[PDB]
């Protein structure tokens, strides 16, 4: 638990305005605690300057004690304005560190690999980033607001009560802080289980209500309304049990804490009374002792809540620092070359064996050649493993056995960014960003003006359907935009492809939908935009009645390439429409 | 804003243990504030009993001031234990009121009508119940913890400072509380906009991350990782702007508040000094005045956060009290009769005209008769409005024109609960409760033992497939259970129907799925369980090649019944398989 504190003490520095305002935060911390401890001393002086017999000098308050009254006021005001200014100044440092850490972690995540991003749910990762960065924010914020200043003030109070009254009073206030902290830590560790129980069996009741209201037709059809009401009562009853235990334990915590300070303040009042009756102290030293220890009691009023959230931050920060050290599985070879990509695009597979979970090979000892400018298609049965082809050449994965060469160069030796620039993809299903259609089309090339977007809408016939949209192509689209049809989604994908202008083109199960006439329209569309555009293109389909009129055909059975040639040579195998029995 | 306070002051009462512990809460409130204000008076006595010249009696602390030292300790301890005990005691009252209000609102919601439950999203309604009841909890909790006790203590402090020192000191502390409350209310109203901005542009960044990580294949295929990182930077930058403004405004609030008390305490210190030098007061009366006003400053330290959440509670509580006064659209006639239901089940429609949005009639001037024990089906085109039939007879809706009679009695005159008991439904799609299959089957009859569930699994062949489930029929099923097939969902529905044992049976688009062989199996299954079980049954299908062999057939064109008779008379119209062109 101290290792994380070491790391996150070390990191926030190294800018100039950052270090300037953290110096200002520390300066206001120490000045605030000094002006805080000077309040009881000026209160002692006000008491002890008016404790003269009025048969003495008397006179105006300005002459007797006006300096120390104004100094009491100024010390109180300054001691809280310094607190609020150190908070306002260190919050800038905390927030900037949070922004740069969250950005670095997000970039790391996007640089990780598909096995990782299919292992774990994305909502979990983004909540990990969010809660880990709020945890780091609370660690810096807590260490500068609560943990350090009240420890500094405990030090100064045990020092002044030593310098003026002896080690009796320092011993009492140090034993008080030891007992108060032991008690508050133990009780708030015991109490957070009640807090999380009252949160768990509140989401329980909320989702019981959600389940009953989603299934409203069902609950009404079977006439058991009272059953749902009773189940909601039982869930809410568990909630009220846990909330009552939370409030009761909070009462126990607060009462025990102030029993510890009231025992401390009473014992120091007694020893101050012994000091006064023995003649050592004065009467004002009583309010000095009492107000010093009580002023310690103001920051430590939140010891139970800046330890619960501090430990929760050290739990979430650990998950974020677990994401920050995962891996890079597919890495490029050092000093990778962008070479051999501007050639006549040929992809040759050499004895390639790849499968998900290598104990079950899906693609087995495969070798092929895809020349330049050719509309080649690959066909096969369902689940044979054709879809890995793209995921193998885009170097989303690696070939466990065998090698891949684009125009006489191994993929493991080519620079990753230029490789993935050169490739262009139309996926089987294209998810759409919850944005404007202008930006979904623009996602092919971010630094593209509007006219390129318009042309991309033209070339695959999107412009008519975006004129048909309400706001033009400024329409907000997505899962929360307008519910659209899959054919227009692949039109968006091919518009992305047109804006990329890549050498290599892939259409990986681009026709996988229900009907045929929209499919044959989009097939035609991508044909006149892909052939007569002089780029090498690889279709992928298990529906070969769609791609029977392509240029070069290859077929894969059970992980091996079997037949390679034209349509008529394929005609001895399936390729007839005979699979349309249903 | 005061009307809600009137209502929720009025309601929590009327039980005996409830009123007992609210009496105990109020007793501890007043006792706590009394023991709180006695702390500065015992501190005055400790100061003023040791301010004697030590040339006087002197002696032990026990003789001089030991009673008042122990009384200072006891008053502090008691004044905080009474606070914590009034909180622990009034929390029971608050939670029980919340449970009964949330149950009443939930029962009200389930008693509302389908137009309402299709108008509004269910998540919105359940968050309305949740947040409205947390709002009522915070209103009772806040009014007993913060708003009332600190107003009582302000009253007692302005009363004691009047009784002992004059109206000068009461005027100063009342002007202090007026200025402190005006300032804190104005600043926390100005500051909550920053708080909600920092919450809105944090969900913005979180969903930007969610959108980028869901679309991971897409962002990797177009090589624009830096684009997503930059957009996450802009969202997080807006977050850091708003969080910096939140922390800065909190610093302003806290510093201004303690400027107001420090000006108050200094001005009262000055007038106490004038009183001491004039001989009126004593030196201990200075610590009396200072500690009284400062002890007021402890509860008012949360005035900015028990007003923000109090106003948010009066916003959510209003939405809940808007749900609590909606309507009952379809109500039963007063003294409705359960009569005419145990007859030979015949349903006659008389000149019935119903449509959604009555400016567009969907069903138009319809009259038919459904005798007892007959397997009758109704067919027609897509969207003609056949599905309203069930929703018309179950009295989910009302016939705008025309009347409905089951066995010579109008539906508007029959008791609703016995009506909906007598009806049994197999919906087109049956949602399944996120529970065990044992309870989804049990939902037909809640007070059914296991053997009835087993028999219901037998009669439609569910028992084999629940033996096939991992835990037997104890398997947890649902959206988060095991992903199942639709045919087994309708098997669950008909098992529900068997456990109901109703006279009337409806199968409203029960066959609406993709394939046919599972459909023909489930059609057969429901046939041998429905006919030869001597209950009148109404199938509903727009796929009449499935129901062509039923007993009685009726057909509806464009909202009017056209032909009624056997299968051969229907054969002159469609009913051939000729619609299977695709
Ligand atoms: N002073 C108490 C808690 C003070 C406190 O927690 N105040 C705010 C948060 S700063 C609160 O309401 N927390 C909820 C809780 O602790 O139950 C302690 O020693 O733990
Ligand atoms: N004393 C400050 C607020 C003290 C406070 O509210 N602390 C905690 C626990 S109740 C909190 O909720 N802070 C949230 C905030 O106000 O930003 C005021 O007068 O508003």
Numbering used by the authors:
A (entry chain B), B (entry chain A): 95 to 676
Excerpt from the publication:
Previous studies suggest mitochondrial ABCB7-type exporters are involved in maturation of cytosolic iron-sulfur proteins. Here, we report a series of cryo-electron microscopy structures of a eukaryotic homolog of human ABCB7, CtAtm1, determined at average resolutions ranging from 2.8 to 3.2 Å, complemented by functional characterization and molecular docking in silico. We propose that CtAtm1 accepts delivery from glutathione-complexed iron-sulfur clusters. As anticipated, the architecture of CtAtm1 harbors the classical ABC-fold, packing into a homodimer with six transmembrane segments (TM1–TM6) in each monomer.
How then do [2Fe-2S](GS)4 clusters associate with Atm1 proteins for transport? Interestingly, the 3.2 Å map obtained from the above-mentioned E603Q sample in the presence of the cluster provided a distinct structure, CtAtm1inw-opn-occl (RMSD to CtAtm1inw-opn 1.83 Å). As such, the conformation is reminiscent of cargo-bound ScAtm1, AtAtm3 and NaAtm1 (PDB-IDs 4MYH3,277N5929 and 4MRS3, RMSD 2.6, 2.0, and 2.0 Å, respectively). Indeed, the presence of additional cryo-EM density is detected, coordinated by residues in immediate vicinity of N395, namely R285, R289 of TM4, N348, Q351 of TM5, and S399 of TM6. These coincide with certain of the residues in the mutations (R285A/Q351A and R289A/R402A/Q351A) that display decreased cluster binding and lower iron content, further supportive of the notion that they partake in cluster cargo binding. However, the inner gate is substantially reconfigured in the shift from the inward-facing open states to the CtAtm1inw-opn-occl conformation, reorienting the N395 and F396 pairs, first pointing toward and away from the cavity, respectively, and then vice versa. As no GSH or GSSG was supplemented to the sample, we interpret this feature as a part of the cluster or even a complete cluster with one flexible half; however, conservatively modeled as two GSH molecules. Moreover, molecular docking of [2Fe-2S](GS)4 guided by the cryo-EM density suggests that binding of the entire cluster is possible at this location in the CtAtm1inw-opn-occl conformation. Next, the cargo is recruited to conserved motifs of the binding pocket, coupled to initiation of occlusion and perhaps nucleotide binding, as observed in the partially occluded CtAtm1inw-occl structure. Our data are inconclusive regarding the nature of the bound cargo because only parts of the cluster are detected, although flexibility may partly explain this observation.
